[PDB]
Scaffold this active site. Sequence first.
Site, short mmCIF file in Angstrom:
data_model
loop_
_atom_site.label_atom_id
_atom_site.label_comp_id
_atom_site.label_asym_id
_atom_site.label_seq_id
_atom_site.Cartn_x
_atom_site.Cartn_y
_atom_site.Cartn_z
CD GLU A 228 -7.65 -11.68 1.91
OE1 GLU A 228 -7.27 -10.69 1.27
OE2 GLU A 228 -7.67 -11.75 3.15
CE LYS B 190 -12.32 -8.62 5.96
NZ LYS B 190 -11.39 -7.80 6.81
CG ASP C 16 -9.63 -11.42 7.26
OD1 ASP C 16 -9.26 -12.58 6.97
OD2 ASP C 16 -9.25 -10.41 6.60
CG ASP D 93 1.91 -1.15 3.54
OD1 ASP D 93 1.31 -0.95 4.60
OD2 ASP D 93 1.45 -1.85 2.61
CG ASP E 252 -5.67 -11.79 7.18
OD1 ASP E 252 -6.48 -12.13 6.28
OD2 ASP E 252 -5.61 -10.60 7.56
CG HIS F 149 -1.79 -1.04 1.50
ND1 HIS F 149 -1.37 -2.22 2.07
CD2 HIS F 149 -3.12 -1.20 1.28
CE1 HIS F 149 -2.41 -3.05 2.16
NE2 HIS F 149 -3.49 -2.47 1.68
CG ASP G 37 -5.00 -10.83 -1.70
OD1 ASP G 37 -4.16 -10.64 -2.60
OD2 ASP G 37 -5.41 -9.89 -1.00
CG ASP H 244 -3.83 -9.95 2.36
OD1 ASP H 244 -3.16 -9.56 3.34
OD2 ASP H 244 -4.92 -9.45 2.02
CD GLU I 77 -8.30 -7.96 -1.04
OE1 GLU I 77 -7.31 -7.54 -1.67
OE2 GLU I 77 -8.32 -8.21 0.17
CG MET J 120 -1.47 -5.78 -6.74
SD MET J 120 -1.47 -5.25 -5.00
CE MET J 120 -1.64 -6.84 -4.18
CG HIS K 41 -11.64 -11.20 2.23
ND1 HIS K 41 -11.28 -10.06 1.53
CD2 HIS K 41 -10.89 -11.20 3.36
CE1 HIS K 41 -10.36 -9.40 2.22
NE2 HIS K 41 -10.11 -10.06 3.34
#
Lengths: 388, 388, 388, 388
Positions: free
Chosen positions: D217, D183, D255, D57, D257, D54, D245, D287, D181, D88, D220
């Site tokens: 994802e 969710k 979530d 980040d 992950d 991102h 993802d 992810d 994406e 990406m 998700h």
Amino acid sequence: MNYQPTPEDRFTFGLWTVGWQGRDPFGDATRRALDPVESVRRLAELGAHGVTFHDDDLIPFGSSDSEREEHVKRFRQALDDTGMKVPMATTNLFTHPVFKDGGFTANDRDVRRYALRKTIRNIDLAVELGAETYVAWGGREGAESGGAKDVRDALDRMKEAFDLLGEYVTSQGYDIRFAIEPKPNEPRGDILLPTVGHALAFIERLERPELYGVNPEVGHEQMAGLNFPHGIAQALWAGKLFHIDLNGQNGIKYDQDLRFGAGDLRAAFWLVDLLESAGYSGPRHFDFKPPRTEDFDGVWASAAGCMRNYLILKERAAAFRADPEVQEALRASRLDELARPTAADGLQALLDDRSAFEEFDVDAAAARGMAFERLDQLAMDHLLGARG
Amino acid sequence: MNYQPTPEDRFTFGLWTVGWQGRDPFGDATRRALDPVESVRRLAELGAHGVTFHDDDLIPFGSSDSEREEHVKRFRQALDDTGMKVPMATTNLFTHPVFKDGGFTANDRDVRRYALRKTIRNIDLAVELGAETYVAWGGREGAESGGAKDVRDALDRMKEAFDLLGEYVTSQGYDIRFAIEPKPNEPRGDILLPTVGHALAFIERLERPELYGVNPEVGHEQMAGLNFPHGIAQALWAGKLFHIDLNGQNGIKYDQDLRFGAGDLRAAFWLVDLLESAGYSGPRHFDFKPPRTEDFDGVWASAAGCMRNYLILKERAAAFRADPEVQEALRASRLDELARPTAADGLQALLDDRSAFEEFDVDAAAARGMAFERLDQLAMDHLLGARG
Amino acid sequence: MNYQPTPEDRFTFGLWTVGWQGRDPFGDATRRALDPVESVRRLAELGAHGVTFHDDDLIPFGSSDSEREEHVKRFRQALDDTGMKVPMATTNLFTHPVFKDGGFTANDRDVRRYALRKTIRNIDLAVELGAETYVAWGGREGAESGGAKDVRDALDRMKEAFDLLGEYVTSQGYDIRFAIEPKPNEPRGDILLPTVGHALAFIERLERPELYGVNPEVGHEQMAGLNFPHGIAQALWAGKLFHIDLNGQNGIKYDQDLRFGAGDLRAAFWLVDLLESAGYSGPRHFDFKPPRTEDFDGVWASAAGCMRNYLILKERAAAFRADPEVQEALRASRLDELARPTAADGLQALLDDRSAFEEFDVDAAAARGMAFERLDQLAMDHLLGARG
Amino acid sequence: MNYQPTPEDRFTFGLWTVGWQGRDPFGDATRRALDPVESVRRLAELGAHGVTFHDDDLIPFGSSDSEREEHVKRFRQALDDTGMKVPMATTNLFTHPVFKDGGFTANDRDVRRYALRKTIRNIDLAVELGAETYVAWGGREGAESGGAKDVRDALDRMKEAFDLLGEYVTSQGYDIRFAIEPKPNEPRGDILLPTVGHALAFIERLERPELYGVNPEVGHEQMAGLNFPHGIAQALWAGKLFHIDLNGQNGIKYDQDLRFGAGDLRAAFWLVDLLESAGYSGPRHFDFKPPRTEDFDGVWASAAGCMRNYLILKERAAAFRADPEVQEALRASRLDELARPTAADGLQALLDDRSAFEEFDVDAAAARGMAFERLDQLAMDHLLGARG
Ligand SMILES: OC[C@@]1(O)OC[C@H](O)[C@@H]1O
Ligand SMILES: OC[C@@]1(O)OC[C@H](O)[C@@H]1O
Ligand SMILES: OC[C@@]1(O)OC[C@H](O)[C@@H]1O
Ligand SMILES: OC[C@@]1(O)OC[C@H](O)[C@@H]1O
Ligand SMILES: [Mg+2]
Ligand SMILES: [Mg+2]
Ligand SMILES: [Mg+2]
Ligand SMILES: [Mg+2]
Ligand SMILES: [Mg+2]
Ligand SMILES: [Mg+2]
Ligand SMILES: [Mg+2]
Ligand SMILES: [Mg+2]
């Protein structure tokens, strides 16, 4: 006709509820921190009866014993100035990184001993402030993977911890009881004692079970898709509903902590009906979070709404039960028969009763309708204020 | 290396599993009925140890006392011819319309008395056939609406029913124990005693609690999103795992009853690890339904797969626990410390131990990693047979 | 003040709803079959506008072409005698065993061809009876296991089937449109096109997409934990809400088909608000099942309740939107700004607008509260009839 | 036999994954921040192909244009030193408080314009770094209450935002495509475009739909209880799987992950089978979040496990599809017939084919078993490496 709370309604709030700054797994705080003293005064003005706290909400972590006494004294002055009470307190064994694998059931033994000493320190403070109930939410007791936690050993450790806390309060002569708050998941992938049933069962294995009950939370049981009024009825039946956390939840997802009345509204109606008809006399405690979309005016609006929706539902449930048309429908659906013993005549008279088997007309019994849909629409009309 | 079952593996199946004709809420039967005698012989040939039944699976409802004796005698001959045992039996209190509002907690008192007499009749038959466990699944005890069932009165009625059954078997001198099978929903909107925890808690309120345990079912607890190995560990910890129903389930939805190993495969691995490491010695009972897509060859293929997947997972879990590299990882993650008492030194020595609080280095403890991800990938490599 | 339906409210019911005999996966029928003619007259007396049917509800499966004409003629007489209309019809491609692996996406090609011919036969009948909408619920299109269905090939087959049906009705000159009804699971372990979104996306790949829309069902989207008013808004936005199925559902579990208003009551309020504010003009169709606890009086009571709860919620949602205090709160929460284009000035003017980035005061924007909790409590007070 | 990744396996990781410090809704960070440069080098050593980011980040929020160039230049040096690519990139429109009610669909218009300018700035940077895909996760687009968001107006605003981004990249001549994406919830109570289907449907209404696809994802879609391989098949069928993802999730809850392979292991097997058999050629992007129990060695162990489990499942799925015994079982279950057109002969020949209806033997077709359980146990034996 009016829905204004008074402190005799026994509504209570945790400091962490209205004080939630809005930090979530994906975003920063949207509100500044509130001083506990300001929350007490603001809640008193809205008609609340009292507040609750975790040790770390009141006294910041690592505080010198002298900064501690200053924090408590200011709090105590706000309580005296407002008439607010502190009926419950609890320990934070979940925020600091040292608790990342648990407090009472952390795999590291030194962490388990520290968690117990942090707990005992706060029980002394709770008693000083007059709390009657000490809550324990083991939010980090659990696992994300199967091999990380032997659950039988972890229950041994959990039992050992609660047994030592029971020994402590009895050896000190304190009049305080414990309430375990179950939650199925979040923040651990699965949490131990995930539902009201698992907590009730665990208590029966403690050395002094009469000192322990449950503190069920609306959204927690709904995170497992369970019927919260049914679980509260089981808790009342067992004599173990020591405290209750009220909030709203929309289904099986992360813990939303919406204001009470939001989420599943009909479940809120049946919960209030049950608490009021069973004569539950403890605090009506809200464990909720004003959404992070809100500024401080929205925080107080959300807290007021908690209380308002409880008082509206109380009125509607009372109207339901007092309606002669509902009382007749309850008889039509044989709720009166459910309350009669099946076999007060005893086992041998049941075995000799041909009317119970050899001569029972099953087809005639099967054909009787239960009339539950008419009863449920009367309940809906009462909830919506649509009686005519 | 080989995965062939033998009757010493104690695998058992209900008559209703392989005998399921395929009727679902939206469709007609896709398979013809199976004679119980043929199921016993077919299951014996696949390596099963035994079969279980509801009264109405064996003896069609309303059967004359003479048609009853004929049905039992033929069954008994198939058991003698094959070496098959009958370790468990149960009552059907859910299919006939008279049970539409429940058996033991139906609002109509005459139905509750009939349900108990139907039950007692079948306990006598179970004992005759040598069953050691009598299961009760209260599939119709529950409600679709809030006013239809007062849950405290219904738990009183449930307690009364189980207490009378306990009085019956002790007065008869029978060596049989009861196992309650929880389920959260389906076919009622919410079922009473919805999870293993709620059932364990209820048992502790019965007059003779030592006669009652649980019969948890994989898919049932997963219908509430709960961790089935964790719930079985709590049951083992309480000394109440009397029987177990094995099957697969893909998440929170209707009860799928897939073959064991299907559904959540890693949960199946951890379940087998736990049963084998705790030395569970009861039957490994499959309560599953071959999908209605299948003909009779697919039925037997599905039943064989139940057994095969248990034996593969047993092998992989044994390999996991025997691997020296895993044993070192367990120590690295402090599973050995979890098994040590937190405070065998006692409460007063804990309160005087400065190393537990005043001088505990919280930052150093917090920084220690738990190494759980390495341990979990070793478990994954073992499950997939990918060790090198 | 009054909540009596009239046929101008456009309330419709499927023959299979009030005609459901009570058979569920665990139990036998509790009610006798109803003659379609009697359902039409009974529903007309309650104030319904019309009825809908599957081919097999009206004409029993395998019927001779002459028994067919007799069944239709009697039905047609009841419609003429009562003023009842038939706005929608659909095909049963799920009950008979031949459809156990699907109709349009069955792996066997001969079954796919039969499913299309059974469908085409009923579209002709629907047109004769004046239906405007033909619904398709692919309840058996799906799988319990991963290798059983290649989903890309199955979507090819689904597209081929709907494309042929579109060719048929255009070649015949019929004025009827198709509505696909999504469901995530049950009776298959996963069903294809599981949600309103997946169905909308699929339609865009059909050869004549303007002939196809969706028929969303309240409980279906809630079986995936989704927000049904949000999914209906997306359908309205796409111009594809051709029909709607109304009922209630308590969360993620088997499809309960409770009466409308039961289940998630606040979601029902927001759904009615949206349908009435968007000017949805199709039928308000109830696809529900009176619980099997009920006799025929409870069936009619449950059907009446469907209509009553829609009319109460309509009144409350209208009162909400007309309240000047709510209109001011909507402005306070900037609902008026949401409806304004973000950048009607265009891309280049947005890139040159320093007030949009270089000089945007993010901290000042972040501090503005959205005032959503006050707005939501106004909505709650309106729903409960507690405005003062 | 070996499961070592190489950069030709195209495995990629977001900076935010291994860089997650461990902050969750109930606890503080357990790990220090990682410098992006160190993550790139560490991931390169494990065999990764590339990283994603991102904007926030890589470049801390509010950074001066000169601190920006320094951050990028150091990153670019690590990429050059290691051979790592950046396929990406994405925008953070969810962490800062200004995005508390959304970015593109915030009710405040000035926030929507700012969100677009923040986005456009980062697309330029992504192109410079050679990204081919620009992802958008609208994590704050949604609502906790019904009146806060008119969803039709919000979809208008969402469409307007993506249409402007499409205008921007085409006017600049950039070769980059967008991936949305979905969710279903978290951090908003319901998020707009909650599933792959809703996103696919939305794209078809954009002005230049060929520029947009999906980035589904694993966890998700499983948060809505949906079958992730089925949703990916629909995306592939539509030609819209632009990126993916990968991670793990245990059911319907927050979530999690988890690392890929954890969570639902059989769904991971069928996902890999599908991606490899369809020839998906994009990045295999993880992810995920190393659990906060772990120190930095556990972080790298968790990341390596992502890659290892993909390569084990690839091997097992390839072995499954290459097994002649499986190929025969696929024919036995008529997967070959599913791939043949139902009616290549056309509508009129179907209507005249008596073998499709008048003379179709439905009972004979119904009796054919699908043999899916045998096929699924072959798939299980292959996954577990238990073929003999
Ligand atoms: O710690 C006790 C508790 O009630 O306070 C908030 C936390 O989520 C929990 O529910
Ligand atoms: O009745 C006992 C039981 O184990 O048999 C099948 C039923 O579903 C239940 O799970
Ligand atoms: O077949 C169309 C439908 O609307 O009728 C009932 C079935 O469950 C489905 O929802
Ligand atoms: O922002 C894009 C994304 O893929 O990165 C992490 C966030 O949770 C989301 O899933
Ligand atoms: Mg909570
Ligand atoms: Mg709480
Ligand atoms: Mg079951
Ligand atoms: Mg069972
Ligand atoms: Mg339905
Ligand atoms: Mg429907
Ligand atoms: Mg995620
Ligand atoms: Mg992602």
